[PDB]
Amino acid sequence: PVVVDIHTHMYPPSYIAMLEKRQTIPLVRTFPQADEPRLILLSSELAALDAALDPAAKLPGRPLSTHFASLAQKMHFMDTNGIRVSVISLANPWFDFLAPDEAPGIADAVNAEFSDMCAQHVGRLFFFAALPLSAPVDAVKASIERVKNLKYCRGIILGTSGLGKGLDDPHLLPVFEAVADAKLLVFLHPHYGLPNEVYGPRSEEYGHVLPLALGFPMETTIAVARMYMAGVFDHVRNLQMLLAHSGGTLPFLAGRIESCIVHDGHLVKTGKVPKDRRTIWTVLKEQIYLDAVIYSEVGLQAAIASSGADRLMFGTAHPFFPPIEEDVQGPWDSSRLNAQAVIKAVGEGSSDAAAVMGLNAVRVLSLKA
Amino acid sequence: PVVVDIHTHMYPPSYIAMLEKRQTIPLVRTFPQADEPRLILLSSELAALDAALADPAAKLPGRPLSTHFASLAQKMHFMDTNGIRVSVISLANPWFDFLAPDEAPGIADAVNAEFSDMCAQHVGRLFFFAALPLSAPVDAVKASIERVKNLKYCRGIILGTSGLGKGLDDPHLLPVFEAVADAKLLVFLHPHYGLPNEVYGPRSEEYGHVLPLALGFPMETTIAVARMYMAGVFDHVRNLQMLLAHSGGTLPFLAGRIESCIVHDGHLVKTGKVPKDRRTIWTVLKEQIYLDAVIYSEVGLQAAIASSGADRLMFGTAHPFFPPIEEDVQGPWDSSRLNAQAVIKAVGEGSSDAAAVMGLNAVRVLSL
Ligand SMILES: O=C(O)c1c[nH]c(=O)[nH]c1=O
Ligand SMILES: O=C(O)c1c[nH]c(=O)[nH]c1=O
Ligand SMILES: [Zn+2]
Numbered sequence: 001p002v003v004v005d006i007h008t009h010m011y012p013p014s015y016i017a018m019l020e021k022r023q024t025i026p027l028v029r030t031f032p033q034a035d036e037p038r039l040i041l042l043s044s045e046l047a048a049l050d051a052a053l054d055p056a057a058k059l060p061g062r063p064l065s066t067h068f069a070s071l072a073q074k075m076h077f078m079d080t081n082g083i084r085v086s087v088i089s090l091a092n093p094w095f096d097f098l099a100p101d102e103a104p105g106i107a108d109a110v111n112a113e114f115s116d117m118c119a120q121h122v123g124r125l126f127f128f129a130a131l132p133l134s135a136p137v138d139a140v141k142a143s144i145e146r147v148k149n150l151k152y153c154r155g156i157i158l159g160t161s162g163l164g165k166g167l168d169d170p171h172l173l174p175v176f177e178a179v180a181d182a183k184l185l186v187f188l189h190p191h192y193g194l195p196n197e198v199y200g201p202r203s204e205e206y207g208h209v210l211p212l213a214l215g216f217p218m219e220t221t222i223a224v225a226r227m228y229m230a231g232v233f234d235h236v237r238n239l240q241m242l243l244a245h246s247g248g249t250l251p252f253l254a255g256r257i258e259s260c261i262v263h264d265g266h267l268v269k270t271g272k273v274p275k276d277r278r279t280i281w282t283v284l285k286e287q288i289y290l291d292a293v294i295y296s297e298v299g300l301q302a303a304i305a306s307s308g309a310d311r312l313m314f315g316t317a318h319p320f321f322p323p324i325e326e327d328v329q330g331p332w333d334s335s336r337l338n339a340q341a342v343i344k345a346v347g348e349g350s351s352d353a354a355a356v357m358g359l360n361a362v363r364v365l366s367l368k369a
Numbered sequence: 370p371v372v373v374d375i376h377t378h379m380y381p382p383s384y385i386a387m388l389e390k391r392q393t394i395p396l397v398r399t400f401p402q403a404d405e406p407r408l409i410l411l412s413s414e415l416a417a418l419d420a421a422l423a424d425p426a427a428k429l430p431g432r433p434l435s436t437h438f439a440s441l442a443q444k445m446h447f448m449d450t451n452g453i454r455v456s457v458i459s460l461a462n463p464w465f466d467f468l469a470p471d472e473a474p475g476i477a478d479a480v481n482a483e484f485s486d487m488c489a490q491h492v493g494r495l496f497f498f499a500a501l502p503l504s505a506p507v508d509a510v511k512a513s514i515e516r517v518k519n520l521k522y523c524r525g526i527i528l529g530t531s532g533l534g535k536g537l538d539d540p541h542l543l544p545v546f547e548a549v550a551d552a553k554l555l556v557f558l559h560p561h562y563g564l565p566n567e568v569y570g571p572r573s574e575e576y577g578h579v580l581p582l583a584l585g586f587p588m589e590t591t592i593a594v595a596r597m598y599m600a601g602v603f604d605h606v607r608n609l610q611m612l613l614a615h616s617g618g619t620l621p622f623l624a625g626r627i628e629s630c631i632v633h634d635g636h637l638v639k640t641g642k643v644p645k646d647r648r649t650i651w652t653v654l655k656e657q658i659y660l661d662a663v664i665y666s667e668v669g670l671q672a673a674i675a676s677s678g679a680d681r682l683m684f685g686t687a688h689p690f691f692p693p694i695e696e697d698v699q700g701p702w703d704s705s706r707l708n709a710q711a712v713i714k715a716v717g718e719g720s721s722d723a724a725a726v727m728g729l730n731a732v733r734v735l736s737l
């Protein structure tokens with residue numbers, strides 16, 4: 001049985017060294033009272049960083065294990081968790097924070113690193129590239145041309161900020177067109193979350209649960225809905241999009257979105273809701289793929305009902321949710337839960353199981369050579 | 370056999386009279402080019418309101434205040450023509466949240482008694498959720514709860530996500546939840562405040578009400594409940610029962626992710642906050658949470674049913690917020706019919722589960 005993981009990240013050592021030299025988010029710090037460094041990515045982690053410098057105050061961020069930067073460690077995880085092929089991607093926030101002039105050069109270097117990592121285990125590793133979206137659109141297009149010509153590259157991973165004004169930014173259209181024409185799957189992934197005040201004044205007490213469990217998928221939903229409302233999928237008809245975490249909440253809210261559209265007085269009266277309009281259901285079946293990183297047959301079944309079994313792809317979200325604090329060199333419960341969600345949704349040994357667990361990814365992303 | 374609608378709102382004439390006086394949201398305002406007044410409730414509508422006050426050619430702000438918001442005869446007509454036998458009505462958002470602390474108890478108690486009066490006009494076909502003066506001191510809120518407990522036709526409390534002003538995980542709110550639950554009143558949690566409008570980006574004004582209504586509302590509900598859960602409110606007030614607007618917002622879809630994030634949260638686990646015997650969000654969804662079926666899809670409804678059980682799903686319409694555009698409002702409403710069809714597609718017409726979701730659950734749970 002062929003298992004493929006399309007949701008699995010790394011930070012190359014050069015990228016981590018960069019983060020260690022940074023003053024502002026994202027950054028890496030190393031505290032004396034802990035072994036491995038602290039990865040600090042979110043604005044929700046800022047106060048804990050401030051607080052951690054008594055040493056009895058909790059360590060900020062999350063630990064930067066060897067599973068972030070070691071390729072042997074990625075392969076070990078794959079071998080121990082029964083994964084044949086990984087389509088690896090740079091973790092959030094990618095190159096979003098880089099200065100415009102430096103961004104393309106660093107992106108092309110780091111993208112080439114990922115290609116080289118894939119060459120170490122040919123057949124078992126492909127990758128999503130990231131883009132220098134702080135740079136001019138000219139440079140973004142140039143970087144897109146490069147990753148198209150890098151071996152083992154099968155798509156682009158990107159966040160919700162776009163050029164800095166979201167994914168409904170009309171300046172971003174030529175970027176979507178270039179990627180779509182290059183036959184590169186766009187993997188949309190969260191990072192920026194929601195403004196932290198929505199979590200209220202006790203959010204610190206709940207650890208990372210609210211920003212990660214709610215903020216991330218809600219961010220993804222908002223970004224895709226904006227793309228949809230802006231007509232991006234109509235503009236770029238051959239654009240294909242993989243959505244992280246089974247679309248965030250999109251499968252569950254697709255109906256409410258459709259109802260709110262057709263019952264929007266202003267939009268209907270101003271010709272924004274025409275008779276031949278492609279519904280979000282249609283887009284979900286034609287231009288959107290969903291990963292199966294949803295941790296439940298309940299969510300997964302909604303995702304399957306929305307996009308179809310042939311458009312769902314298994315993922316683990318490695319290395320972000322290691323087991324606490326047991327054998328990290330053993331199987332990961334966070335990976336197992338998603339495999340269990342699939343099995344319970346469609347039945348183990350079913351062709352839908354085989355499709356979701358790897359064959360969809362093999363087919364859609366041409367995972368050969 | 371009996372169709373019950375538990376998600377259906379009104380503003381009494383006295384409440385609308387308050388809104389017509391107001392400067393800031395919520396408010397009602399008449400513009401010259403429209404027959405119906407304009408109801409402006411949301412933060413996302415403020416830009417359009419300001420533009421319309423300056424520029425007469427700018428688009429009408431908010432939404433039409435139809436007769437279906439205030440008229441009891443229109444509610445009964447809506448019910449008769451959409452095949453609804455019983456409605457558990459409620460004051461619509463933002464309830465009494467906007468009132469000054471000093472004036473809120475008196476107004477809240479007077480309006481709650483008006484709802485009792487309205488229900489008495491059509492015996493057996495109308496019941497209601499009351500609203501609370503949550504801007505007032507907690508002793509005033511508890512006094513209001515004591516009153517609505519004994520109000521004829523009252524079967525629960527509708528409330529928003531703000532609580533006393535710091536959300537539903539506010540320790541100072543626990544006496545309120547305790548009093549409501551001991552009063553055997555069901556809490557109907559409903560959105561209003563949404564998300565900070567900046568999440569919708571610089572083109573937000575081109576998308577109508579879609580993003581705040583379709584995304585903001587359900588996400589707000591999810592965040593508020595998740596905060597209650599993480600704070601241990603459902604254990605601490607173990608007898609508390611909650612009806613969640615719009616099938617829990619997104620909770621059925623995110624319950625698995627929440628559970629995984631909790632058990633894989635380094636800080637929470639190491640600090641002993643995640644014992645193996647903890648009542649999971651699934652357990653709470655199955656024992657303390659009811660979900661309405663206002664989800665507009667069999668996809669969404671099946672997820673809700675799987676999460677809480679068919680015995681804990683209840684039919685609703687969100688009347689009068691999504692009228693047909695702009696055709697016969699006196700006919701059947703699609704926004705009602707869509708949800709009824711979702712139920713049939715999910716559990717099958719003529720089934721016990723269909724009968725349960727469409728009204729028998731509500732009759733049992735709310736003692737109608
Ligand atoms: O859930 C995830 O995939 C992630 C969660 N948290 C992160 O910081 N990065 C991720 O990729
Ligand atoms: O969908 C709804 O239930 C509502 C939508 N918009 C509102 O302003 N009030 C509501 O109750
Ligand atoms: Zn991820």
Ligand SMILES: [Zn+2]
Binds near residue numbers: 378614
């Ligand atoms: Zn409502």
